[PDB]
Design a protein around this ligand. Structure first.
Ligand SMILES: [Zn+2]
Ligand SMILES: [Zn+2]
Ligand SMILES: [Zn+2]
Lengths: 56, 81, 226, 222, 48, 171, 55, 131
């Protein structure tokens, strides 16, 4: 709305895509993970679903 | 339309206009910023040199008659040129 | 030159003077005067800031008023910065203006439609809407007041519906002011509009300054099938 | 008269050619507005009487009004042998639609019947009326004698000739859709130049249409 | 039009056109518009 | 309005009524929760036809309760309102919001926004009612209402009526 | 002078956001700058237009 | 005006789907949209300035002749000739009596047109149609 260069728009949409992806799946190959304040990785949806102690 | 066009002369932008109704006809180049105005009298023109469509840089050369004078003109559009 | 070109220039000038601020008028008149312009040309002619032209170019691109061309050329110093050329696509601009004015008047007609119904009932403690259809089942046995399901509060009457004449007057005041647009599109639709591009706009350019960093000559490339 | 004119204006707005009888026009007129045949058959006389009794000095803005009275008297009095053609286009090449309404004579005998009944003997004579028996059928009258004389000559005074192909044996024609063909233009041009080179005093040249004439003269001049 | 070669870079998709190469980032709204332009039988054949 | 329809009901018969005459118990339980019951699917089910033979299927024992789920198929007269249908009625109650008119099993509300402006409410008179310059609307008075719209829940149907259309009102 | 010419719809002025100071002046070749009310300007900026092919 | 509906102000270029609808009573130019707007709730007064006669939504129709006064003439003709259905056979071939009857009915149609003596002519029409 307030105007930005295309570098800023691309960076903002990449940040939004990264936030959505790490909300859906933190464990992405070749991609940094989302980290908490305590230093542990963010327990995402896929981590809460896959593995032994998932929902299933 | 055909008689007037934006041009670059001596790496200086301007407008070429044809003062045809006056006798003799003149080619008046007018500076966009108002720095210098130059009129070419067409009674002492010897040769014209043009560039084809295959050339990337398109450029016009005017050679006068008596050391001959050389005027060296850049147009930014093919149809206008 | 072409009277239709003067007409569509009047279209663009009037719509930017009406529905846009003064700086938008400045940049649009700059593009209308000098047919092809780059970012340094705007910064030289208008003394405008990049952060100031940011929202302007963004709004004029979102409204499809200014077309952007991403051509880079080869200067003698070879510092080929990715200059963007701002020009106008006349059929795209008039189609965008026509679509915007048609959507504005259709949305106003829909607002008039949604104002045509009776008032309804509001609950101000919970700030909840209630239409006449859904307030039927919330009455008491005392048959006195509309009681809410949550707040159990005496409902109040909405002020909507009585503003039907106000919205009609808004339509009247929009329609006579947009009358030059309709009268001009009557002449436009009865005429033929040529599809211009960057190459077409290069035929009618006006020099913005003496020394332009961006070269206006088109450089063709092999392998581009955009 | 005003509601008759407005009915005609309503009948003008159409997108397809309507061909209809006067009886159907009168029936549709009566169904759409209460106008009978009998006042229409006296409309022109009433308009003439009204214009006379008013003593209006200038009648130019009434002039086209006379046409309506003429229409009001034509299509009302006759019911057989005439037609009404309503065309959304007067000319096909116009961008804007210009509708026209043509009340049309189809029976050529209805105008000439009072001549043959009022007069006892007529002598129809034309220089080039052929065939002779077409006219007693096309015009409802009988002839006591028909004959076309053969002119007697010591030498052949006139030389009728028919040209079917040009100089290069290419077939020539004057059909309207082939007026743009270069080859028949070549043949007509070479023919006319050669005859004009040989003709002593003066030519008369007859073309089938004026638009065809305009096209062929423009192509000859180019 | 010639179909460019599309490859993944992290969380985005980029495309390189055939040189007769121009590589550019494919925007997500372009892919959304392309998917909206896909007819019913096209993704029915694809199994969607 | 009134229709004759074919309906099916899933009745959860308790094991306590598993006697030799359980068909009579099932029929009584069917007519307990059908007569006068309101359903948004089929309108107000009022009465049940064809009492001599009612198609009762084989009842399903529930996997955790032991009760028998019977699928009883019956034929019944229903009153399902539709918007755009004009019905007569009698006013049962009135208020400054409007009046409730009873048509069949349904209390259709005509609101104060849906009568012509001549009708005005008064509470000083007994009963508090509506009066105009030509007619009055009181309790237990004949009137004709047009159903502008109806809302159907799982177990309740409420309709909104109007008298603004001409040739309506008291007969 | 620039202030009274601005309200006459004769020239266009570039003014700072901090204070109404005239800096650059262009010719107002178009119509009046206040032909459309502000609520209708908000109505125009709220609405959005579709892409190229849908029109 | 000729092109635009003066009530909703909509033009033909903007809204090509508007249609010519007119009140038979007071004869004001309006579109179908405004008819669906104001008279759908109920009867109301005419939205033009200076006109407040009551009019109904179902009475609305389209003007064939496209001129207001000619529509007035033809609708009074329809309103009168429904009961004024005498022909030459009803007068048993008397041409002069039928001509005077035509003159009288044209005179009363003209009087209902201009409204100069509308009261007694309307009363005469009611007493004639009662028979
Ligand atoms: Zn509340
Ligand atoms: Zn309207
Ligand atoms: Zn009126």
């Amino acid at each position: 709305h307030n105007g930005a260069p295309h570098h800023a728009i691309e960076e903002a949409e990449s940040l939004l895509q990264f936030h959505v992806a790490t909300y859906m799946d933190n464990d992405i190959a070749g991609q940094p993970q989302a980290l908490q304040k305590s230093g542990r990785p963010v327990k995402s949806i896929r981590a809460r679903l896959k593995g032994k102690e998932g929902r299933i | 339309m055909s008689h007037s066009g934006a041009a670059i002369f001596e790496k200086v932008s301007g407008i070429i206009a044809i003062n045809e109704d006056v006798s003799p006809a003149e080619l008046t180049w007018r500076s966009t910023d108002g720095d210098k105005v130059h009129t070419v009298v067409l009674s002492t023109i010897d040769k014209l040199q043009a560039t084809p469509a295959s050339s990337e840089k398109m450029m016009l050369r005017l050679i006068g008659k008596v050391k001959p004078q050389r005027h060296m003109f850049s147009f930014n559009n093919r149809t206008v040129m | 030159d072409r009277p239709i070109d003067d007409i569509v220039k009047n279209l663009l000038k009037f719509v930017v003077r009406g529905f846009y601020g003064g700086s938008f008028v400045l940049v649009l008149d700059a593009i209308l005067f000098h047919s092809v312009l780059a970012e340094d040309d705007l910064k030289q002619l208008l003394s405008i800031n990049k952060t100031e032209l940011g929202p302007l170019i963004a709004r004029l691109r979102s409204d499809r008023l200014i077309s952007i061309h991403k051509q880079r050329e080869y200067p003698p110093n070879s510092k080929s910065v990715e200059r963007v050329y701002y020009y106008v696509k006349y059929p795209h601009a008039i189609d965008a203006i026509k679509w915007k004015v048609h959507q504005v008047v259709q949305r106003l007609k829909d607002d008039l439609d949604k104002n045509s119904e009776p008032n309804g009932y509001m609950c101000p403690i919970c700030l909840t809407k209630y239409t006449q259809l859904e307030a039927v089942q919330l009455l008491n046995f005392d048959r006195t007041e509309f009681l809410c399901s949550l707040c159990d509060e005496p409902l109040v009457e909405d002020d909507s519906g009585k503003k039907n004449k106000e919205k009609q007057d808004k339509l009247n005041r929009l329609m006579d002011q947009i009358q030059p647009i309709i009268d001009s599109l009557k002449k436009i639709d009865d005429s033929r509009i040529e599809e211009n591009t960057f190459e077409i706009a290069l035929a009618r350019l006006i020099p913005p300054q003496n020394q332009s960093h961006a070269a206006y000559t088109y450089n063709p490339k092999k392998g581009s099938t955009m | 008269l005003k509601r008759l004119i407005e009915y005609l204006k309503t009948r003008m707005k159409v997108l397809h050619v309507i061909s209809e009888t006067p009886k159907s026009f009168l029936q549709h007129l009566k169904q759409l507005t209460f106008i009978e045949r009998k006042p229409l058959r006296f409309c022109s006389e009433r308009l003439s009487l009204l214009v006379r009794t008013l003593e209006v000095t200038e009648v130019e803005d009434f002039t086209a009004l006379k046409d309506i009275a003429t229409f009001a008297t034509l299509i009302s009095t006759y019911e057989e042998g005439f037609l009404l053609i309503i065309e959304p286009y007067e000319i096909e090449n116009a961008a804007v639609p210009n509708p026209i309404m043509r009340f049309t004579c189809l029976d050529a005998s209805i105008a000439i019947k009072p001549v043959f009944e009022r007069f006892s003997s007529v002598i129809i004579t034309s220089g080039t009326i052929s065939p002779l028996d077409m006219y007693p059928r096309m015009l409802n009258f009988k002839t006591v004698l028909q004959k076309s004389y053969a002119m007697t000559l010591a030498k052949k005074s006139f030389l009728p000739m028919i040209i079917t192909k040009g100089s290069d044996q290419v077939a020539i024609s004057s059909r309207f859709e082939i007026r743009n063909d270069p080859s028949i233009v070549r043949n007509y041009g070479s023919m006319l130049v050669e005859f004009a080179k040989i003709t002593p005093d003066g030519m008369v040249v007859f073309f089938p249409s004026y638009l065809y004439m305009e096209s062929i003269v423009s192509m000859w001049q180019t | 039009n010639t179909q460019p070669t599309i490859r993944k870079d992290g969380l985005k998709l980029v495309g390189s056109w055939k040189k007769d190469p121009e590589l550019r980032v494919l925007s997500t709204e372009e892919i959304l518009n392309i998917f909206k332009h896909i007819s019913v039988k096209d993704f029915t054949s694809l199994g969607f | 309005m009134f229709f004759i329809k074919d309906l099916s009901l899933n009745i959860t018969l308790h094991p306590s009524f598993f006697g030799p005459r359980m068909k009579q118990y099932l029929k009584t339980k069917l007519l307990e929760e059908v007569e006068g019951s309101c359903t948004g699917k089929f309108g107000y089910i009022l009465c049940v036809l064809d009492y001599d033979n009612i198609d009762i299927q084989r009842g399903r024992i529930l996997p955790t309760d032991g009760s028998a789920e019977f699928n009883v198929k019956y034929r019944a007269v229903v009153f399902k309102p539709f918007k755009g249908e004009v019905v007569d009625g009698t006013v049962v109650s009135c208020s400054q919001h409007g009046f409730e008119v009873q048509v069949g099993p349904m209390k259709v509300f005509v609101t104060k926004h849906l009568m012509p402006q001549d009708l005005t409410f008064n509470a000083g008179s007994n009963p508090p009612s509506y009066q105009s310059s030509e007619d009055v609307i009181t309790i237990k008075s004949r009137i004709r209402v047009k159903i502008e719209g109806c809302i159907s829940q799982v177990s309740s149907i409420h309709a909104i009526g109007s008298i603004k259309e001409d040739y309506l009102g008291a007969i | 002078t620039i202030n009274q010419l601005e309200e006459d719809s004769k020239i266009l002025v570039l003014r700072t956001k901090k204070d109404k100071t005239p800096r650059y002046v262009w010719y107002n070749s178009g119509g009046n700058l206040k032909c459309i009310d502000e609520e209708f300007v908000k109505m125009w900026e709220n609405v959005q237009l579709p892409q190229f092919a849908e029109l | 005006n000729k092109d635009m509906c003066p009530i909703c102000k909509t033009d033909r270029y903007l809204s090509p789907d508007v249609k010519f609808l007119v009140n038979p009573e007071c004869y004001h130019r309006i579109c179908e949209s405004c008819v669906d707007r104001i008279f759908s709730l109920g009867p109301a007064q005419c939205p033009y300035k200076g006109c407040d006669k009551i009019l109904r939504k179902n009475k609305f129709k389209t003007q064939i002749f496209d001129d207001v006064e000619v529509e007035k003439e033809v609708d009074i003709r329809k309103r009168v000739f429904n009961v004024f259905n005498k022909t030459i056979d009803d007068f048993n071939g008397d041409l002069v009596e039928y001509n005077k009857y035509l003159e009288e009915v044209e005179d009363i149609i003209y009087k209902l047109d201009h409204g100069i003596d509308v009261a007694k002519t309307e009363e005469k029409l009611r007493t004639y149609e009662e028979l």
